[model samples]
Target chain A: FYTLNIAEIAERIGNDDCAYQVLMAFINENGEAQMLNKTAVAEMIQLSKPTVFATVNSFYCAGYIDETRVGRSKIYTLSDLGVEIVECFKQKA
Target chain B: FYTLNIAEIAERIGNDDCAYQVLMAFINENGEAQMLNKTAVAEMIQLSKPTVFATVNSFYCAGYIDETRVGRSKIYTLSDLGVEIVECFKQKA
Candidate 1:
């Protein structure tokens, strides 16, 4: 069995931000193709709606995720940087 | 490649704490048979000495690791619950 260097990753990124976990859950649930809304992401990651929104917003600001306006809600997908981070996690395995 | 459900594990345990990461580093570096001190743990995990001490202390209190005072330092080893958590991470693999 392989272990993920989660602490190292958190240190490399920023530990206080929850975007990393949100990104991870997004990648696990949808890979790179599927688009998710805030509510869907909250449910998938088992985080509060506000937390997901704040995390996703941070990701968007960091250029880690892309957001598209779908009616009254926004759809989110991983950007290249986000995908790269997920790929890095996969490499640990 | 498999992804570790770190977020889930953190949520199940506790989010504000760093013991999970400390436990993981100990397991990865020393397995179960080996013993480590706080200095070794801090260096191995690249966390600050105080952070490692606090986290390890918390783990010890939670019955996750065994502490033995040797000379001026205390050597640590994983407890059964700690092993079980590491096994759970492996299962995700």
Candidate 2:
């Protein structure tokens, strides 16, 4: 699969600025020795809290990310497949 | 949230070839006058029969893809957000 496939999955969930931004973040960074959280993501992308929650849930359900409870929040990281997909796009670029 | 976000989500569901392929299909294809099916996707990507079913289910639950029963097969397509995501990646490329 390719970018179209990612778009299809994102579309199935629902189109929103937050969801798109989150997916972009995933595509942009993976295996870069960096991480992100809901708040950090929102601030970076200027998304609302609900958008963050909803988009995160969508990614969680689709198995694109995993969360570890950090203090009172969850930190999200990329999975192997997520990394692979990102690489796929990177190659195209 | 970047590619790592997608990676995290893919990891939560469990890593496997089939799931990854399905998600790839969604990522690579979208509205442009073309669509795909389980059999076509499997044949194109070299996935097992059951893998397609399981992955499709995962995508469905997460609202990543929609299915319309056709005979004993289901035809899947990308949603509005799906298109947006593809465009997002295109820009990065």
Candidate 3:
């Protein structure tokens, strides 16, 4: 059946910054009490640190990711909304 | 398991012009001897005519859709690559 959900998802996460890639990277690294910094995520995803940082900021603004200050660095983790979107993508897949 | 396929799909179809939406509209209308025009697709997808036209042009240039002149209007149908990508999306879904 046709649905607008895919379009909505694309509009929300698909852009020049590779939002889908960044989300998947966070999904892969998700764990209990685990958070990843931008450097680690960039290295893991093989994307530039600036790219990852940009996407991370976008996700944070969109409520897909949560951030906390860890000393001078901001640590990131997938929020419940982020997990739900990943689940949606997986089910669609 | 993690794969880059989703990222690739997002990169290919996720854009400001709603490529994914246009592709789905085409896929939904695909059939033997079935083709749609830009106006019809735009109406079906609830997007503006210019938006659909631009997306159709982009898809045509990318080899994702084939166009044939039907009088003053051009009718569009999915190409083989387009079909393959739609199938990939369906499988992922």
Candidate 4:
């Protein structure tokens, strides 16, 4: 029961880079995406803040993520294209 | 074309912590398992040497991984139980 969820690993992701890892960070155990803020992303990937920002910013710039400013807090989630990219990344193994 | 392996990720891995990430590190872009030396595992998860050793050692102790001695190097790979665990972790979404 605990080992469930890695079936996704069966197909695997060939995309190895910041974007792939970053996007992967957003995914939670429930199969819903986390779409984290910059601070949260840092801990997920064990990388520096600036690098995390750069990747998230690029995601926004590339229109793969939607960002909303909640006062000083900015929350992000994957957009249609982003979801597609995630799907595309997980092709048939 | 570049993003054609994440389908495995689609099911996701509910299994977290050192063991999950460690087994994950053994997975290659080609969907083949690359059970690694302790040194390589350290770099993959961005962890210290001792931590990686403890985890991999535990895996070997638990009968989840196989060990081979090649000169000074010991390479570790998944056994049937490990592969079953990996598959078990990847349940349907």
Best by lDDT: 3
Whole-model lDDT values for every prediction? 0.59, 0.55, 0.61, 0.59
lDDT of 1 by residue, B1-93 (tens): 224333443334433334546767666534444688877878877656655664565455334577788997679888665676667666666
Considering TM-score, which of the candidate structures 1 and 2 is the better prediction for this target?
A: 2
Give the per-residue lDDT of model 2 (tens digit) for A8-43.
444443334444466557544443624788677667
Q: What TM-score does the A-chain of candidate 2 achieve?
A: 0.65
**Candidate 1's TM-score:** 0.41
Off by more than 4 A, model 3: A1-93, B1-11, B14-17, B29-33
Task: Flag clash pairs in model 3.
Answer: A92-B92, A92-B93, A93-B92, A93-B93
Q: How many backbone clashes does candidate 1 have?
A: 0
Docking class of 3: incorrect
Q: Model 4 over residues B1-93: C-alpha lDDT tens digits?
A: 223122332222232255567776877887677768888988989656655565565455334567898888889998665675566555542
lDDT (Cα, tens digit) per residue for candidate 3, span B1-93? 111233344444643235677777876534332488988888988666655665565455334577898898789898765676677667767
DockQ of each: 0.04, 0.10, 0.03, 0.02
RMSD of each candidate? 15.3, 14.0, 13.9, 14.7
Error of 3 at B12 (Å): 3.4
Best by DockQ: 2
TM-score against truth, every candidate: 0.41, 0.42, 0.43, 0.41
Give the better candidate number (1 or 3) by DockQ: 1
Q: Is the docking of candidate 1 incorrect, acceptable, medium or high quality?
A: incorrect
